[PDB]
Amino acid sequence: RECDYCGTDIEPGTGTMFVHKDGATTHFCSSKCENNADLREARNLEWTDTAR
Amino acid sequence: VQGFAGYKAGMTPREGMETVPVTVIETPPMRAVALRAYEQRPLTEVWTDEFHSELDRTLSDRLDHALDIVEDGGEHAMNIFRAGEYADVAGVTKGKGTQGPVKRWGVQKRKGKHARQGWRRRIGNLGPWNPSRVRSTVPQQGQTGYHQRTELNKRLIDIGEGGPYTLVKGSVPGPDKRLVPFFRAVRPNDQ
Amino acid sequence: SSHRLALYRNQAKSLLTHGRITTTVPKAKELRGFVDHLIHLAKRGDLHARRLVLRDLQDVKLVRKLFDEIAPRYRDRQGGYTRVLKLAERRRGDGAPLALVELVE
Amino acid sequence: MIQQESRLKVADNSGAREVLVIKVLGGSGRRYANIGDVVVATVKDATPGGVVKKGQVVKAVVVRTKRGVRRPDGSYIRFDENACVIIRDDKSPRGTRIFGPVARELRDKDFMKIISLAPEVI
Amino acid sequence: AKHPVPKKKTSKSKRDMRRSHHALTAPNLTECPQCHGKKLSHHICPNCGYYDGRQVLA
RNA sequence: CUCGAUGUCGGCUCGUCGCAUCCUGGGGCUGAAGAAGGUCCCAAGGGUUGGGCUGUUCGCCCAUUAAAGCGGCACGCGAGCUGGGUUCAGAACGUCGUGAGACAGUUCGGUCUCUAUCCGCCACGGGCGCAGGAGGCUUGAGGGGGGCUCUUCCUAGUACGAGAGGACCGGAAGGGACGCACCUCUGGUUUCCCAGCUGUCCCUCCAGGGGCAUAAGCUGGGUAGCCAUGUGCGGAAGGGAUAACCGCUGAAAGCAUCUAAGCGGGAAGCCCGCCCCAAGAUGAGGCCUCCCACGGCGUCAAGCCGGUAAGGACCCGGGAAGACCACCCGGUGGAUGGGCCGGGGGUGUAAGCGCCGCGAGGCGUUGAGCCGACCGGUCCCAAUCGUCCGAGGUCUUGACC
Question: Which keywords belong to this entry (chain C)?
Fold first, then answer.
């Protein structure tokens, strides 16, 4: 994928994946993805695998 | 020397099939010093110097098979401990020190409305009026960090030599890496 | 905190000036490494390096003085550009085993 | 995780909305309701009287907790939310339908029923 | 606010006994490097300057 | 006994006994088949939950549970809180009183004090001891820790059973509270490690910084150690002596009787076992590995001196070792600190120049820069040189060379 989108990344040959309601999702990564993303609009996201 | 033992490698888990965390342990054959027997009279420890080079800077199976390696010349490679086994190790607590009856000993402290009142940590009480002065009961700020700790059901998973070393099933060696580890599988229950 | 630094600061400062002062055991034991460390930077020697060293010390004269001045007299070794020497006496009332330290020379 | 009066929504339709957590179901002591687990709480509020109704004595289980669940697969999983499903004594749901995904779990501790109803089980 | 205070004349005896475990122990000092004399085991001095390097006065 | 004064309800915490035992095992009983109850004898090990409303305990109610025990110790605990409350003056009502005041009727609010001496407890050092002087290793008498449990499965839906049900016996698995230990994975830390920021003073103008804005001014994040929300693990076998309780062999009662004598059965319980000390248990224990008879003095001079680095120490340098202390490793024939150096980890691509847009900025160089303890090299630095103390081998008896 791309930490869902968070093109950064973090935590070994395992990692981990957060998640939201509605069969929707959020595979995941670092404390730079999280919080931010968990609170607005992905599009606008830069740094990473979006505003790449 | 009746047993087998060495020091703490460290911990990490990784792989398996579901996955599982253990700990590494260092120790080839720390030579063989006499051997336990109280024969004809009182016998226990001799010393026919054959040690290191520095050591004078300070100068019936378990023990038995020993005879095997302790007469070989001294040393004795560790590892019967094989594939899936339960020895037991006795680490050395951890210079944690003299602390409050808090962690030292489970206990609830200064509640709320007074769980702060620049108030806090400190036991509740000792003994009643009539009973009699005190008990040797209630612990105290009974220092820690130095205890001759250990445990049980110590299962070893695997081992390999490159450097005689052992992989463990759940670490909790007690003491810290580079620490003094001694193992055994005492009165095992999982047997 | 802000104090640990400050120290290292003025001490690092004053020192380089003389290259061996008089503070107690520890005090010195540290002003070393640090100050020390700093040195190793005068050694690096450049835009950056300087922009740091100064960053703390704050002061052309020196800052430069060392980077150029001393730095060299050291360009060769491997840290240690300081020889922390304990002292014989002790500040009064106190009784603190002060001590002296210099740029190994 | 999830006891006293921590609240959690529905994903099924039982006719609920959210529910307060009385007891962690199992036996004495015990202090925790983690998906798969089964809770002894009630309605904090439920639709316009579907079939349940606000403040209704209840029985529900674990399927969504941001407490993070360590998968024997040294893996890790969690959710943006915390809620579960009602049940018929017979570890049997009511909501005819599901909502947000969930986790293998359930299966492991019995419930298929939802296991599949679920839009997606992670 | 004297919750707790002694309760029985401390007993000279004891008292002192207390004050007993106390005691000094002369500076372990040694003898000069070449300074010739007695110095604070490990240091130059108003007799030295040396050690190996003349880092002092007199 | 106390008024030259023992601070009183409930709560909190920390608990400790006891058994008439609530849960828990073992039993005999039943109008007990099963299952589940009832009855009573034996056993306290361990254990006996969240809320509610009430100053309360008590108590009723809510959801659990095996269980949700009775009571001691001034209905334990104020020199340990609580301090609501009954129990200072206010002041209120109601209430009696000509009144004044008043009330186990009520209602608002109403100053719980830093320095433990002794005994006592928990802890760590100092003696002196254990009769050569010496470092290393072990025994444990005797103490202390810990023991609970639900549920799920086969045996089996077989015994029983008209049926709806549901076994001893025998065996898997999970989980609950709990405790020991531990960072790997997880999460909380991260007082400066790294990054973005607005206000301001110095900085030289710009840039590039600097304190302060707590003791970091603010926000994002962040090893290493500590630490849970998290990791291992544990409460078992089994051995012996019993409760109650069940039997055998058989008197006295030529017939019966677990019975005095003889022999066995039988418990979460005692003893043992499993961890945790531990001979200062003055009965100072064992054992191995070192060190040899030095001086001169009136004596059973077991008294004064060089010693033996056997050996230790002190001083230095260091430790998840740590209040001090004691305890551990090192002391330049060293890797012990720091330093440097590679390595990892960590912040998100720097200072500069460059190239696009009037500017704001961007894009590049550039996953840059900078890096606090984590893994390991290298004598740059700094543990130089030096002291002190330390044995000799007490008396009797005998056993062997």
Answer: Ribonucleoprotein, Ribosomal protein
Q: Does A19 lie at the interface with D, CB-CB under 8 angstroms?
A: yes
Of D73, D74, D119, the CB nearest to A23: D119
Name the domain count of chain C.
Answer: 1
CATH of the domain at C7: 3.90.1030.10
Tell if the CB–CB gap between C85 and E42 is shorter than 8 Å: no
Q: What gap in Å lies between CA B156 and CA B23, rounded to an integer?
A: 10
Between CA D84 and CA D64 the distance in angstroms is: 6
Beta strands in C1-105 (DSSP E): 20-22, 83-85, 100-102
CB of B31 nearer than 7 A to strand F = no
Range of the domain at C41: 1-105
Cα angle: B1, vertex B6, B9; to 5 degrees: 170
The structure was resolved to a resolution in Å of 6.8
What is the C-alpha separation between C32 and C38, in angstroms, rounded?
9
Q: List, in order of start, the domains of chain D with CATH numbers.
A: 1-122 (2.40.150.20)
With CA atoms as reference, report the closest residue to C15 among C90, C87, C81, C89.
Answer: C81
Elucidation method = X-ray
**CA distance linking residue B47 with residue B1, whole number of Å:** 13
CA distances from A9 to A12, B29, D118, D122 (A): 10, 45, 29, 20
Contact flag, residue C28 CB and nucleic strand F, below 7 A: no
Residue with tokens 């002065």: B133
CA angle B9, B12, B14 (to 5 degrees): 135
d(CA D39, CA C104): 72
Residue D99, number of CB atoms within 10 A of its CB: 23
Q: Give dist(CA C59, CA C53) in Å, integer.
A: 10
> What's the fold here for domain A1-52?
Ribosomal Protein L24e; Chain: T; (2.30.170)
> Tokens representing B118?
């620049």
**What six digits make up the tokens of C32?**
């070393």
Q: How far is CA B121 from the centre of its chain?
A: 31
